[PDB]
Amino acid sequence: RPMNAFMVWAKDERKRLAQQNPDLHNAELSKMLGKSWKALTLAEKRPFVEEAERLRVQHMQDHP
Amino acid sequence: RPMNAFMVWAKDERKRLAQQNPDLHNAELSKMLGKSWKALTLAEKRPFVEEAERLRVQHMQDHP
């Protein structure tokens, strides 16, 4: 049940937005994140994509 | 074309939210405002309601 590329990338983007806008609702936070991720190119998402692949390998190996 | 009670009340509530959350989109800003206003009771909206009535009078008198 590891995080996918988006979750991996969002984890940091979320804190930066939430630890700055106490009034910014979570639902909207998720919506902004959803769209910013979409606007990104593969070249910009690549590292988050590789990290999700790394995490998936460890899970499938049962976390040695 | 004077502001109604909501606009009158929002004018201040908007600046306080926008001059604090550069990342908070306008569409969402309007949505939050729309709902907070709704949650308010007449007793809390009264002064903004009176101001809108004052403004309407001046307009109907053609702004003397």
Ligand SMILES: [Zn+2]
């Ligand atoms: Zn909201």
Ligand SMILES: [Zn+2]
């Ligand atoms: Zn790869």
Ligand SMILES: [Zn+2]
């Ligand atoms: Zn696992």
Ligand SMILES: [Zn+2]
């Ligand atoms: Zn938005």
Ligand SMILES: [Zn+2]
């Ligand atoms: Zn009155």
Ligand SMILES: [Zn+2]
């Ligand atoms: Zn007028």
